[PDB]
Structures are given as C-alpha cells and as structure tokens.
Amino acid sequence: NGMRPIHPGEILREEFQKEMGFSAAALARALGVATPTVNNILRERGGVSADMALRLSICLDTTPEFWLNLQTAFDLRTAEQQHGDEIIGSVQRLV
Amino acid sequence: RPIHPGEILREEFQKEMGFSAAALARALGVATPTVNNILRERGGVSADMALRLSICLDTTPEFWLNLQTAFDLRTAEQQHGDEIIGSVQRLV
Amino acid sequence: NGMRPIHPGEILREEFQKEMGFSAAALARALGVATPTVNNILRERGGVSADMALRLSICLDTTPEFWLNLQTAFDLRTAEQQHGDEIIGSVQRLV
Amino acid sequence: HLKNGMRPIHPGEILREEFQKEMGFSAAALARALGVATPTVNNILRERGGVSADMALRLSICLDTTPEFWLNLQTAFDLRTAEQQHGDEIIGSVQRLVA
DNA sequence: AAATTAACGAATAACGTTAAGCATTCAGCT
DNA sequence: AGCTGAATGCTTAACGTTATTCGTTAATTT
C-alpha cells in the first residue's frame, strides 16, 4: 500500500516498445490477433487475457505468468483504491 | 495437470473447517449462488472475491488469485496451446 | 475553458434513465441494437453515432439533433482542453 | 416533429463554394496553414472523407469563424445522409418508448 | 420436520474480430 | 517546375457476439 496501481500496458509500451520499436498493427499480426485487440492494452484499457499472456511469452522469451502476474496485481490495488473500503465492512472475519 | 478454482477451496477450507456456502455467503457479503459456483468448480472466481477471501481465511488476496491465473494458463495450455505455437511468430 | 466537457451519456443516464427508469439491456432491444453498444455510452466511453441519434429521437419523441448537438460540443472542449493549446500555435490565421 | 428526410450537404461542398474557389487558393498553402498534410485537406474538397473535430478548431482560426460552424453542418450531413439511406430500416426496428 | 444446495434467468461488463475513419510518403497532372 | 488526385500504413472508433455475477424458483436433506 502507498504506491501506484500499475497496468500491464505500462510495463509493455514504456518498457519493451521503447527499447525495440514495436508497431501495434505489425505487433498484432505478429501475435496472430487483430490490431484493436493489441492496441486496447496499449490504450491501458486492458485487459491481458490468459491466452494472450501465453502468446506474449513466446515473442519475448519470458514466462506467460510474467505478463499475467503484474496484470492481476493491478486490479487488486485498483479495486482496493476504488471500492476497497466498502467490502471490508460487510465481510466479517472467521477463526 | 492443472489446478481448479474450487479444488483448493473445497478440499482445503470448506471441508476441513467450516460450514457450507449459505453462511459463507453473507460472511463474504455476496449471495449464495456466487459462492457454491466455485465449489461446483465450473469457474466464477472474482478478482473482488480474492480481496474478500483473504479476510475470512487470514491469508493474502494474492494467494487465491495466483492459483486462479495459473488455472486458466494450464487448462488452455493443452487446450489452445498447439494452435498458439504455430500461429505466433517469434520476435527479437 | 470556459466550461467542463460534458458527455452524452451524462445527459442520458441522469436526465433520462433516472427520470423514467431505463435499463441498458431493455433500452438496447428498444433501440434495435446490442446491449454493449448502448452501455458503452452509459459507461461514457463513447460515443453517439449518426444512425443512433436518429433512433433515440423515436423513443424519446425529441429531435435527433438534440442528442447530436451535445455530442459535437463535447469533443470540442475535450480537444480544446486536451491538445487545444498546440492547435492554436501551429495554425496561422488567414484574411 | 416527423420524418422522413430530404437532400443533405457535405462540408467540402460548403468549402469549395463560398470559401475555396471564391477569394482563395488551394490545398498546398492551405495545408501548411492548417498544420496538416495536403492529402488530408483536398479530401474534403473532393468530399471523399469526413470533417475532423480537430480540424473544426483549426478552421475557425483561419476563417475567423466558430469551430462549431463547420461541425454543425457535418453532423447534419450524416444525419441527412443516413436519413433516406438506413432510414427505412431504423424506423421499423426501433419501437417508441414511454414519453 | 426444515432449511438449503443445485438449477434458471437477467443484469452488466468483459474480450474479441470486423469494418471505418483518419494523417505521411510515392505517383500523375497543370 | 510546379502542385492535386491516387496508394498504403498507422491508429482509433463502432459494433456485434460471446463470457462472468446476483435474484428467484425449485428440489433437496437428518
């Protein structure tokens, strides 16, 4: 707690895309998917699919869990920041 | 080879500790059908649930989500995996 | 500058959905379109189509220009406030 | 408060007449005046294309008019365009709501 | 004797592919 | 000695179709 809710397209576009110049359209067919599908993640609108993470790992010689792990961590502190306070009151802890 | 959402719940928490989904429902602040859907194991794991789930079970929310994403991954691995390797061309 | 930009779905969900109770799914089939198409306007992601505005006028017994006029006014002070400063510098006035 | 509609008019029609041919020169100088490339511009005089929202802000500047001017006739175009075009299909498929 | 788990059904909101709309860089005129 | 109409790429819009989440009835289970 106390840091930003970082999205996947942030660790994509400003990390990989900047080191080697990637074009969303060319990247799409490189991934075997339609352009908007790709560009919707670059638009930070998300999200990363599980089949998506699997294909990404192929291109980038990483593990598919890599692209998925930071993705889920986003939502957590997205919703934690959005409605997170509200769920705590309704839920009562168990032994 | 994969691990399901409800397999690590029903076989760990629901059976070896407490009572059934009805009481668990209002304890999690959601309706009953939402809960047993995971016990019925056909999917339905919320991201929002994990935040709620960590609370009852004194665990981290990250715990329940880590196996969740790993689920989709391993299921689809044999499922769409063959199609994925061929269609996707490697990058530098 | 001088006012905040206002989206169509704002003058929709508030003035209309709240005054007479609307439901995005039912409004969808009432408008002859798929639900997300409708709810994407309520989500204020945008945006109002020209064929759409014509459809709305039928349901709401208003003119189609009503829904379109506020649409164009939005983009105007969206872009005016976003990149608008950059536009003024690059454009040179004519007689 | 009734349809259906009649003949539309595009922005590039209201461009070449009243603005482009009268008192003025064409797309080469006009491009650089608007900060955009030539093809973007003549596409409207040729009427193949739409009127941008970003352009309307730029046109108001050159022609000492409001940006709303150019955008108002733009939507009226699409509305009137689609009015006879998809109009038959739209009236039938859409059923009026409580009002 | 009596809740309750499993099943229908609608809501919204994802993801996705498809199709259209937009500004640079080579070719054909004026 | 030019500059407008084509041809191609990018992105972003709009849309439809297809999946996950709560009410409510029905069947179950001491």
Residue numbers in the entry:
A (entry chain D), C (entry chain A): 4 to 98
B (entry chain E): 7 to 98
D (entry chain B): 1 to 99
What does the paper say about this structure?
GraTA (Growth rate affecting Toxin–Antitoxin) is a type II TA module recently discovered in Pseudomonas putida. By sequence similarity, GraTA is most closely related to the higBA TA family. Here we show that GraA does not contain unstructured regions and forms a globular dimer while the toxin GraT contains an N-terminal intrinsically disordered region that is key for transcriptional regulation of the graTA operon as well as for the RNase activity of GraT. GraA binds tightly to the graTA operator and GraT prevents this interaction through steric interference from its N-terminal disordered region.
We determined the crystal structure of GraA2 in complex with the full 33 bp operator at 3.8 Å resolution. Surprisingly, in the crystal two non-interacting GraA dimers bind at opposite sides of the double helix. The total buried surface area between the two GraA dimers and the DNA is 2234 Å2. Each GraA2 has one of its HTH motifs interacting with the central TAACGTTA palindrome. This “central binding” HTH motif binds with its interaction helix α3 to a TAAC half palindrome. No hydrogen bonds between the protein and the DNA bases are observed. The other HTH motifs of each GraA2 act as the “support” subunits and interact with two distal half sites with sequences TAAG and TAAC, respectively. In these distal half sites the interaction is again directed towards the DNA phosphate backbone, and no base-specific contacts are made between protein and DNA. Binding does not affect the conformation of the GraA monomer nor the relative position or orientation of the monomers in the dimer.
